[PDB]
Structure formats: structure tokens, C-alpha cells
Structure 1
Amino acid sequence: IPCANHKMHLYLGAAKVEVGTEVTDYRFFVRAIIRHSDLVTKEASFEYLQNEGERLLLEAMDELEVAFNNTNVRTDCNHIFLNFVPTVIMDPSKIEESVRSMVMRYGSRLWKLRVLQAELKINIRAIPIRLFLTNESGYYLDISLYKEVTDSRTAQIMFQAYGDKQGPLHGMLINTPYVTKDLLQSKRFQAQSLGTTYIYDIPEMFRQSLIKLWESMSTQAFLPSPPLPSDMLTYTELVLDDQGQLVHMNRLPGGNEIGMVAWKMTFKSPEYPEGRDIIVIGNDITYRIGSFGPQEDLLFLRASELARAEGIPRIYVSANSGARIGLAEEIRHMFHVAWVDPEDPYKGYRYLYLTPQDYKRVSALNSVHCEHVEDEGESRYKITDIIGKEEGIGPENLRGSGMIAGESSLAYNEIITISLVTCRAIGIGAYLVRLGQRTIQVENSHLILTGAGALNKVLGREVYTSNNQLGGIQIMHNNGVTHCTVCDDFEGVFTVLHWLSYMPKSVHSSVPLLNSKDPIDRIIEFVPTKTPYDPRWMLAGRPHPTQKGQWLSGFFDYGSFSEIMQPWAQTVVVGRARLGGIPVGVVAVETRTVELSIPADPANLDSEAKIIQQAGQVWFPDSAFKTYQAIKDFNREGLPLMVFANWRGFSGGMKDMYDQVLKFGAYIVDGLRECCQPVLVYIPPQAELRGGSWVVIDSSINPRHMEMYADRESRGSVLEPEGTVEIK
């Protein structure tokens, strides 16, 4: 392909195929020549390497961008090769660092351009070195380094690495050609082409996320030295035998014959540096697009059974299309229509039938049920029922779906259940997410029951454009379904691990305690005032407003607070935190006024969007239901509750009474009566409890676990002073 600055020689290559199978592998190759005189280093070649690396990388990406958009062959694995003529004196490790930083900072553009491999040739001092980079899924960059060694018996030259991490090309010939994709590719490519990660890349993400976790928590607690990455995570794949039972198997990735995959993972975390277990279940989006079948359902069930039997968490990665459907194609090409008028077909038909020639070839399969009739002087087998010889498309998928739904409902009440939504979930998939009640939703993913196209067909006009209008973040995160939103799959995995760091390793274990770097014996530097304030300031603390540095400390350990369900029912704040290294669930009350924005349904042209002012220190239907959800979820999670109670009562207006405030207020009581962990209610300063808001959190509900404490600047009664003087 010609281009400007033709030192960057671009080629488009198509894999050689036989006269049978067509061509599906197309790849760009950038082959560049960098001419320059040799360098003498006095620690003065760093700028050369950095500047040339950056300049050449940017030029490569730019030329490739132009040529990539000029054609449509849908390439996958683009490659860049930079051959540097001059010799440089430098330690190879420093070159590694330089290339690493340059690639990472521009990793996003390389990802968009599908640049997965890169090679750099450069001479040291002179001995050649060859840097080989693999940059797949955008969380991890792999850099290898090899020397070319000629000490062979023939004229062939081969690579020799440095002993530490020899790598795949160790002892390989330097003239090895480029291959034409593999087992994992052409499935990994499809999955990434849908905006989701391939299933068999999930374990690796966990490992890398754990690394980040061990770094992230280093500012909160006194942690031991982390183990090497090779000892942080080990897993075994869970497969089905011929009977339907689980087998622990170690095999290469990409060998799944069904659309569901599961693993048992053991890993070391800062809070449990001896190993904790989890079960991970995931949909393969590329296997018969999404689509729960009977075997996928069975594997889901058996893995969930395992998790309950061991009492450990269950993680579900949702990327599916709902229940599997199909049509009996063996009949589709055989049936004939019995017309009312065979010459004028527009006066109806009476039935569909098979001729004997077709019926005799299917009657032995139990694929169709017909009855013999004589009509129009012909022998016909009138179709009354179609069964289908193919299994996994019929009503058996309804049963199976219901089956696993029940399992999820049980699992939530025995173990930890966490769900991550990476691509999409339709129908049963959404329910499977919901029944876990702990949902992480990636940006540009949706949870729906009915697609936009179906709804447009039903309603008769193009009402909806995108499925994100039906189940995207702007709905699911604001109505209380999604707890947390993340930008990509990797952040989602990280969030899962982050949440797990607060809770027991198993249902039979205590809460994990950390040796915190925030002293317990300090005081709280932020004082709640009489005027409205952000409840987060007392929970976590705030930047010292007087100065530029200096953080004013809050009640809980610095940096430990993590809020969930933030934009839903914003009059109440719920989250997780640590007190002296002790994980707790947190409930708190907003005292500022908030604005609830309600969108307009595009299917009702007479609807309007509305803004409703919600005052603080009030229980509304939404905030009451949110509080119930938090209480129930933390009771199942296994954490004590710390409640900062500042409610002046329930809303008694017509619209909140119509919207069932009383029901949710009752649910709060029923939630607290089933607590098994300590529940500590504290009335902060300049806070009050009045009337209905007391009787629903009173310690008499669950006397064994509940306690109430008050500050000196607190108040509590049935009626506020004004309401008392108006009577007495």
C-alpha cells in the first residue's frame, strides 16, 4: 500500500487458503527502516531512544489509520516492525522500560487499530536484541526480549532468551514465519467485536486485578509482602461428564463444547493471604449467539450447587441472549399447504401436510405427529404437532430456565452472589442477574426483557431506537437495580474483588479484620453542623477547606468508604466501610434537598419529564425501599450495621401515600427482625428521631443484636416541639 513518508512500508497480507475454504484472515504489516548514525552513549542516548520510539510509533499508527479506513477487509492482528540501523550503548532493561511506557500511554490507539504484535530490532554497543511485544486485551502488556545466537551446528540462527522468563520463542529459529490465526482467535475476535471480553480471558483479568488490589489497599492497612503473580491465583475448569456431574479438569482454553464455562478459583487477597475460593460462571457470547440451552443450564445449576455446598461466593458474568429458540428445519423444507382454492391461494388454506415420501423418512424419529387423511384424491399426513428431532430448542428450555432461576433464589439466601454484566442480558439472563441482587453493569450494556425491535413491531411505529433506552445505565442504575457502574470488563473484575475484600471468605467464617494504618484512638475532625451538609463528610472526611493539603478525618477509616446505588433515592446514603479495620455496612441520611428527575416515556407522547424536590431527613418510598434492600443485603453478606439515624419521620403527603410508603416502612421492620449481626444505631449531633422513624428501628425489634446510642446534641421524641405545643 503506498503512503506518505515511504520509510514506513505498509503491506496488507491475506492468509493463503486452499481452493475450498475462503479467506478470513487479513492483516496489516508496517515494516519501517530507521536510518541514523551510530550513537556514543555518555548516558546521553536515553532521549534518542525515547524520542525516536515515540515519533516512529505515532507515525506508524497514523499511516496505519489512513490505510485501515481506506479498505474493508476486517483485519484482526496488525503488526508493527521497527528496524533501527544505528547501534546504541544501553542496558537492555532500560530499553524495556522506555518501550513499556511508550506503548502503555498510547495503548488505547493501538487497541482501536487492532495492533496486537510488535517487534523492535536494535543493536547493543555489537550484539543484536529483538523486543517482542504482545498487546491483547487492554489491561496487560507482555514484553519479551531475546538475543540472536548463531552458536548452532548449521547456518541457522536461533533465539536465546535471558533465562528469566525464556518465553515461547526460546530456541526458535529467527526466520519463523507468521502464522494464520489459532484456536482462541476467531472466537476472541468475535467477542471483542461485540464490545465484550472473551470468556477464557476472564481468569487472567482476575490475576491482574488482584495485583492492583494489593497496591490499592497498601495505603489503608499494614499488609505483608505480596507473593509473586504466579502464586496469586490458581484455577481449575469445571466441566460436565456424561452423567451431568462436575469434573475438575485442567485443559487448554477454548475447548468448550457448550456456551457456558465455569471455574473454581483460589486466590490470595490482602485480607486473606492464605487463599480464598470462589466459583466463577460465564456465558460464551460466541457460541450459538448467547443462548442458554439445556446443558448450559445444567452446568450453571451444578456449579451453583457446588458453591452452596462449600459456602463460598458465586460470581456470574452475564453475556447472553436469553433462552434458546429454534425451528424444526427438517419439516420446513418438506411440508405442503392444503389450499382452499389451489388456483387462488388468497381464500385461505385448511392445513399443512406431508406426503408419504416425506412422512416415511421422519415417522421413525418422532419429529412430527401427523394423521393420515384422504383429500383431493391424495394420501396425505396432516400435521397436528411438531416436536423436532433437535434437542435444545423446544420447551425443555423453559423448564431449565425456571430451574436455574430457582437455584439463584436459593443461592442468595445461603452464599454471596455477585453478577457482572459485560455485554447484554435478555430475559432469563436479566432475572439471573437480579436474583443475585448485586449487579455491576459495564458502560454500554443493557438488561432487558424485550428488545426494542419487538416493541416497535407490537406498537406499530418506531418508538425505540436502542436497547439502551430500555435497560441501559440511565435506567438500571437510577432505579436501584445496578449497584455500581464501571467503564470496562477489567474494572468490573476489580470491583468484584474490591467488594469481596469486606466480607467473609465463606459463610462459616468471621468478618476479615485488617491492621489499619488509620489509628483507632484519634478523634473526628469533622463535626456535623446544624445546617445542611454532605453525609459523606462525616463518614469518610473531607479535604481541609482552609488549606490545599490536610484532610479532615471522619468516623470511618480513611479511604475505606465505598458507596453503592448512589443516584437512586438520594435522600439516603448506603455503603461499605471499615472502622479500625473492621468492615461494616453503613447507612446514613442526607440533610440537603435533592432533585429527583423522572424521564418521559417515548411510547406515550402525552407524557412529560418531572423534577421533584425531596427534602432531607425524610423517608420516602424510594429511600425506604433502598434502606430495606441495604439491610437485607448486608444481613446476607454477613456484616454488622452502623446506622447514623437522622429521620424526622415519613412522608405523609397524598402522592407518597399513593406510592406505598407505608408498605416499605413495614419492610424495614421485617428486615431488622432478621438480623444476625450487630446493629448499632447512633444519633449524630444536630440530629433527631421523631415518631414513625423511631418505632421502625427501635432496639425492641431485635433485642439480641440491636443497640441505640445518642450524642449530647441529639433529640428524640414522638413529635417535634412545634407539634407538641400546638396540642398541649
Structure 2
Amino acid sequence: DLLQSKRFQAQSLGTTYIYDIPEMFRQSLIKLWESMSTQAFLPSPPLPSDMLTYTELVLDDQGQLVHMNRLPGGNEIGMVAWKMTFKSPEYPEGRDIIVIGNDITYRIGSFGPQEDLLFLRASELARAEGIPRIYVSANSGARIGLAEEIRHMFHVAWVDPEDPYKGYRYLYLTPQDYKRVSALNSVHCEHVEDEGESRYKITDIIGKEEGIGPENLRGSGMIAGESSLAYNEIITISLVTCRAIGIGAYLVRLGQRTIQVENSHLILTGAGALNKVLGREVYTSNNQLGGIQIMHNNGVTHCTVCDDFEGVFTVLHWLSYMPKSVHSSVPLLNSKDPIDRIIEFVPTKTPYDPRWMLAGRPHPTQKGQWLSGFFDYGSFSEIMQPWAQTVVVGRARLGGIPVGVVAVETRTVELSIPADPANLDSEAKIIQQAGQVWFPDSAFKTYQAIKDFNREGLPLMVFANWRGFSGGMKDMYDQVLKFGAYIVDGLRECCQPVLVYIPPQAELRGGSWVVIDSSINPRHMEMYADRESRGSVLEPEGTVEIKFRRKDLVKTMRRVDPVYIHLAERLGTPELSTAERKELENKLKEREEFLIPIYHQVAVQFADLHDTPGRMQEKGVISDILDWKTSRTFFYWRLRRLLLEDLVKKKIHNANPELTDGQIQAMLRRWFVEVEGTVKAYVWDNNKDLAEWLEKQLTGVHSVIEENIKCISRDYVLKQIRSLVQANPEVAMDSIIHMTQHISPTQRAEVIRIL
């Protein structure tokens, strides 16, 4: 087939032929079923033929999408798209996605207006159904061209033919040549008599070939816009295979979640172009500009893979944490890591890799045993690892509930900054980034993680351990203030549970606390402190510095140090010689000075006792003091009901949008007490037990809530009709005639009663 020819052509470009992608999904999906059986209890996999179904989406005459079951290799434009349904470990009954891909073999994978349109319409469909959009990008950006019909027939109006370097005046077509293109919308000319001959001065070249013109600019913008909207409406993921150029780059980025194969590059302008502009061979490879060594290191790319197969797997792997559609809840697994276990790994005052805290680590002594982490064994999947490494973000599972995750590096990061080849001064610098601090990069990565996960529909778990934002000259100049603010915007827009936990030996202070306080989004945020955690506006050393200065240290001495006491007691005698006095005062001053260091230490301790969880809870800024060993169990159940409670409350809100978050809470709580009895109030505060109860309501008499909501809606619909008539009374009479047109003859009787 031309098929053999095209696959070779793709391989020779270091990518996969577009129509091989679907089967690459099937193979990857098999690998997923295998890898996940480690982590969870799964049913027996389906047979591979029943595992996946695809249908090609193709543009009709009217530019409308049409589902077509045709043989591969049939594309007449440089873009291909499919709807795919497949059975996965997390969604064994099946889940749908839309996949769009460039065909790098068709016109070097350029983006013409038709290519742009298919992309648009596939995206539009993804949004229509609420399902994720996967884009495989391997392209050359917007299509380029010159009007062939004119190129081969134009003439130059030389200042002087016997010397061209004396300049030219204009380009033109002979009347013979004009008389043919003229009918066809190819050029605009103005006739002129010049040097004796009659000529057609070319003023504009329009070009009879559609798709090589500024229409491509609109088309590109068009799908740029679409992608911006998509990110905000559905799950978007993108895989960069060979190269994504220009609009290709922008689409990949607007999609946000990005996988990049090694040796692929993601660029706006090519090393060649730039070298010509700079007058020498500055850059040797596009990877210098757009390779993973730029984009993985700056957070544009989330993950890198060695090949296309591993790319597709990653897509499916990510989706395994994500709800099937936007109308859907997060997909739960039955994990092999039990829920009622203790966490063996313990965070320490000594610095440590926080990945150990999340995923666990190998045992230092009797290997190959395993010090268990907080999350389900094998569930933590990081992203953006090498960028802003002061913070660590990823997805994991807690009892098989997928969550998004943020944690803090405690060890000093050593950031390597590559040399700018453009600039001959630049050598590769090496920067210290302290642990437990937000820098501009870290703050940005944190914000990004918050946004992305939130749009996937995941709950959030923040393991807060930040001493502050770096507030030094450089970092302030580098806009650390701007990005700290963003974290606030980010959390405020969260729509599912956000649980913040200060782990043992962690601390949370001042600026860092303020931008993640539960107050920002009380509807959804919750804050917890381990017994062995600490938190304040200001750390003890800095507090003492301001509010336990010398005068106060000495006061403390006067109360506690016996020597000072004795001396002070004597200065408190009347009728002393000014001699004896000055001697005493000096003895006291010497004592004071000798005692200051130790008493300073006492002072920081004193301050530290103010910063405890005990106080935090008492003052109402945290929901509970937890204990790390059992934090996993706690959080499973808590998250589990937060999710269920939310699900029911969402139903209530639909019944009557006018009801406050607050009144809704109360209403549900009141309905529980009504059903289960005033005697059982306390149960409400038990996560496990309320979780079981809520679930039974949602899945004869477990139509108790369901009945109340029907009530709430009836009432609202009444209030709504009332409001309309209040505003529009001439409408009353006719509304009734229409309303009565059918109802029970015994209700017609009643109507007459009431009026």
C-alpha cells in the first residue's frame, strides 16, 4: 500500500504514522491493565478486541463533522480525529475520549484552513459531550505558500536592463499573461504604458490557491481560541511527537497538560532563522530552543517519554486518575493498599525527600521491605519534576480515591541554569534554592498545579510546610509578590475538597499561611495540623526579636535568677551610699550580660509555645489536630464523606440556586437529625458512619433526602412563577387559560372554589 510508504516516511521523521495511533492506544491500554493490577484489585481484563473502539471523524461538504467507518490512509487533509471508547481499570464499563492528530506526512503536517476546521469541530464535540480532548501534535505550523500561477510568469521592470544593480521599479504581467489569470482572482493589477510596451503592474497577489494565505492566520487564531476555552471546559492533554511549531506550540500549551517525547521540540522560531538574524551559527539544534531541556525544566512540559508508545501510555495513565467526563465523579479503585494501616515513614526535623512521605521508600535496614508512605503504594505520579523543585506536585490515590497533591521540598535545591549561547558572557550558573520556601518559580508551579487539577475535577491535598515566600531583592524584582497572589486566586476557584495538612516537623508561617488559609474558600477548604507541627504569623526567633527584647529578658531574670534576685533585693534598700549602689548596679549589669544568651533561649521557647496546634484549634483556625501514623485512615474517611456530602449538596443547589452554601449545610444536617433522631446528632461528626448513611440515601426509605429535594424544587419553581407574574401581571389571565386546558375535572372544580 501507500501505507507501507507513509509509515516509512513517518518513521524517517522519528514519529508514528497518524493511523497507527489508535492501535497504539490499544497496546498501551493493555500495558495499563497490567501495571494497575499491581496497585489495585481489578476484574479480569476484557479481550483486547473488546477493550477499545474507535470511529474516525471526518468533515462533510458543509464543514460539519461526520462519523465514518473507513479504511485507514484515507485522509484528504493534514488532520485526523477520532472518537474513542475504551474499557479501562478505572472505568471497566467504558469511557470516551476525542483524539485529534496532525498527519506529518500530508504537506509537512502544516495547518491549512480545513485542517484548522477539523480540529475546531472535534474539539467542539469533545466539549459538547464533556469528555477529554487528546491532541497528538506533530506539525509545521500554519501553511505557507506563494502563488505558483504568478511566480512563473511575472517580469521585472528594471531601471536599466543593461544593468540590473541599478535597481528595479516594479513587477508586472504582460497583457497576454494577465488575460488568463485575470478571470481567476489571482492578482490585482493596474494597467500602465511604460517604455513603449503595455504592462500590468502587480499591486496585490491574491493567489488562486486556497489555503496558502492570510486565511491561515484566522484559522489558527480560531483554534487557539477554541483551545483556550476547552481548557476551561474539559480535560485537555497533548503529546508532542516530532515537533510542534507555532500554532502547534500554542495549542499544546493552551491545553496545558503536556507530554513530550525526547528529541522532539516545541518552538516558535527555528535555530536557522535566528542564526541568520545573529550573523553567526549561535544555535546548532532546535532542541536548544524547544527541546525537553528547556520545556521540561520550565514547566511547559509535564512529563517526558522515550518514545511515542510511552507517550500514549502516559496519556492513558493520567486519565486513570480523572473522571470519565465533566458530568462525572472521580473514578474510585479498590486498592490493594489497605485503608486502616499506619504510615511507617515519619517526616523528620532532618531534611528529607518529601516523595518518601507520599509514596514511601525502601527500608534502610532489612531490605527489600518497604517504609510505607501516606498514599496508596504505587499511586503517586509526579509532574513538572525538574522545575521549581522547591515544591513537588502530582496525582495519587488515597484508598483508591484519586487526588491532586502538593508537597514541599525540605532539602536545599541546587538549580542549574544553562548558559545563553546568544550571549558570550554567559557561563552556566548554579543557584541555591532553600527548602521550605516559595520562590517565584515554586509559587507559579503551585498555582499551576492547583489550576490544572481543579479543572480535572480532583480533590486537592496540600502538605503545607512553608516558612514563607523569599522576599529578597532579586526575588521581589522577579515578581514573587505576583505569583503568591495567584495561589489565592487559584484556591478561591476550587470546586472540590481542598485538604491542607501541616505534617509532623513541618511549619507554616506568615505569608505562606495567609495565601492558603481555609478562609479563602471556606465552602471547600479545610486545614489540619499534626501535633508535631507549628504555625504563626511569625517564627519564634523573629518574634522574640521584636517582642522579647532586653528590657523584658532582664525583667525575667529579676523574677527567676536567684543571684540577680538577691542583688536586686539589696538595691531595694533605703539609705545606701552612692558607692555601695554603683557597686551593686555593676554587679547586676555583669550578671545580666552573663545571663542574656541562656535567657534568650528561654525566650524563643516561650514564643514557640504560642505557635502550637493546641492554640490553633482553640482559636478556630484549624479543624483538628491529627497524628501522622493514623493520618491516612483519617483522611480517607474524611475525604470520602466530603465527596458524598458535596454530591448531595450539589443536588440541593440545583433544586434552588438561591440557597446559600451555609443554609444548605444546615438544611442537610437538619434532615439527618429529622430522619435518624435527635438522639443520634453525634453521628454526623463521624466521617465513616455518615459516609455510609449518605451513600445509602444516594443509592425503600433511602428516598428520604431525595423526597426533600423534590420539595425544595417545587417550592422554588412556585417562587419563580410568582416572581414572573409579579413583574408581569397582564400575563396572568392568559397563563391560567393555558394552564387549565388539561387537569382533573375534580381540580377544575377546585379552581372555581379559589378565586
TM-score (norm 1): 0.75
- Residues 1:721 and 2:540 aligned together: yes
Aligned residue number for residue 549 of structure 1: 368
Aligned residue number for residue 126 of structure 2: 307
The counterpart of 2:157, out of the listed 329, 335, 338, is 338
Aligned residue number for residue 280 of structure 1: 99
Give secondary structure in 2 for the equivalent of 1:218. Answer: helix
The counterpart of 1:610, out of the listed 429, 454, 474, is 429
Aligned residue number for residue 274 of structure 2: 455
Distance 2:357 2:108 in 1: 49
Distance 1:420 1:446 in 2: 11
- Residues 1:209 and 2:28 aligned together: yes
Comparing 480-489 with 603-612, greater Cα deviation is found at: 603-612
Task: State the Cα deviation string for residues 475-499 of structure 1 (Å, max 9, x = none).
Answer: 0000111000000000000000000
Give secondary structure in 1 for the equivalent of 2:469. Answer: coil
Aligned residue number for residue 248 of structure 2: 429
Give secondary structure in 1 for the equivalent of 2:335. Answer: coil
Distance 2:147 2:279 in 1: 29
Distance 1:465 1:257 in 2: 35
Runs of 5+ in structure 1 lacking a partner?
A: 1-181
Distance 1:346 1:226 in 2: 75
2:373 maps to amino acid:
G
- Residues 1:643 and 2:484 aligned together: no
Distance 2:538 2:117 in 1: 57
State the 1:581 CA deviation: 0.6
**Matches for 1:375-524 after TM superposition, within 5 Å:** 375-524=194-343
Distance 1:383 1:692 in 2: 65
State the 1:336 CA deviation: 1.0
> Using CA pairs below 8 Å that are at least 6 residues apart, which structure has the higher relative contact order?
2
Aligned residue number for residue 150 of structure 1: none
Distance 1:183 1:359 in 2: 39
1:582 maps to amino acid:
I
Aligned residue number for residue 679 of structure 1: 498
Distance 2:304 2:343 in 1: 31
Aligned residue number for residue 105 of structure 1: none
Aligned residue number for residue 701 of structure 1: 520
* Structure number with higher helix proportion: 2
Distance 1:345 1:502 in 2: 68
Tell which structure's C-alpha radius of gyration is larger. Answer: 2
Distance 2:145 2:39 in 1: 54
**Matches for 1:23-422 after TM superposition, within 5 Å:** 182-422=1-241
State the 1:606 CA deviation: 1.6
1:426 maps to amino acid:
I
Give secondary structure in 1 for the equivalent of 2:309. Answer: helix
Give secondary structure in 1 for the equivalent of 2:355. Answer: helix
Task: State the Cα deviation string for residues 449-481 of structure 1 (Å, max 9, x = none).
Answer: 000111111111111111111100110000111
1:393 maps to amino acid:
I
Task: State the Cα deviation string for residues 595-648 of structure 1 (Å, max 9, x = none).
Answer: 011111111112222111011010100000000000000110100001100000
Distance 1:687 1:376 in 2: 87
Distance 1:352 1:229 in 2: 63
Give secondary structure in 1 for the equivalent of 2:108. Answer: coil
Task: State the Cα deviation string for residues 167-200 of structure 1 (Å, max 9, x = none).
Answer: xxxxxxxxxxxxxxx1311111100111101100
State the 1:210 CA deviation: 0.8
Aligned residue number for residue 581 of structure 1: 400
State the 1:292 CA deviation: 0.3
Distance 1:652 1:521 in 2: 42
Give secondary structure in 2 for the equivalent of 1:185. Answer: helix
Distance 1:460 1:329 in 2: 31
2:64 maps to amino acid:
Q
Give secondary structure in 1 for the equivalent of 2:393. Answer: strand
Distance 2:426 2:345 in 1: 45
- Residues 1:526 and 2:345 aligned together: yes
Task: State the Cα deviation string for residues 379-408 of structure 1 (Å, max 9, x = none).
Answer: 111110100010000000000000000000
Aligned residue number for residue 688 of structure 1: 507
1:529 maps to amino acid:
T
1:479 maps to amino acid:
N
Aligned identity (percent) is 100
Aligned residue number for residue 103 of structure 1: none
Aligned residue number for residue 670 of structure 1: 489
Give secondary structure in 2 for the equivalent of 1:613. Answer: strand
2:366 maps to amino acid:
Q
State the 1:346 CA deviation: 1.3
State the 1:235 CA deviation: 0.7
Distance 2:444 2:509 in 1: 19
1:229 maps to amino acid:
P
Give secondary structure in 1 for the equivalent of 2:120. Answer: helix
- Residues 1:558 and 2:400 aligned together: no
Distance 1:726 1:340 in 2: 83
Aligned residue number for residue 599 of structure 2: none
Distance 2:202 2:336 in 1: 76
1:274 maps to amino acid:
E
Give secondary structure in 1 for the equivalent of 2:41. Answer: coil
Distance 1:432 1:485 in 2: 18
2:107 maps to amino acid:
R
Distance 2:433 2:244 in 1: 33
Task: State the Cα deviation string for residues 513-532 of structure 1 (Å, max 9, x = none).
Answer: 11111110000011111100
Distance 2:151 2:119 in 1: 33
The size of the alignment, in residue pairs, is 547
Aligned residue number for residue 25 of structure 1: none
Distance 1:341 1:540 in 2: 78
Give secondary structure in 2 for the equivalent of 1:700. Answer: helix
Distance 2:285 2:90 in 1: 42
1:407 maps to amino acid:
E
Distance 1:422 1:625 in 2: 26
1:360 maps to amino acid:
K
Distance 1:334 1:534 in 2: 69
* Structure number with higher strand proportion: 1
1:532 maps to amino acid:
P
Aligned residue number for residue 96 of structure 1: none
Structure 1's consecutive aligned runs of 4 or more residues displaced over 6 angstroms after TM superposition are none
Distance 1:465 1:717 in 2: 52
Distance 1:470 1:452 in 2: 7
**What is the aligned-residue RMSD (CA, Å)?**
0.6
Give secondary structure in 1 for the equivalent of 2:2. Answer: coil
Distance 2:408 2:235 in 1: 27
1:276 maps to amino acid:
R
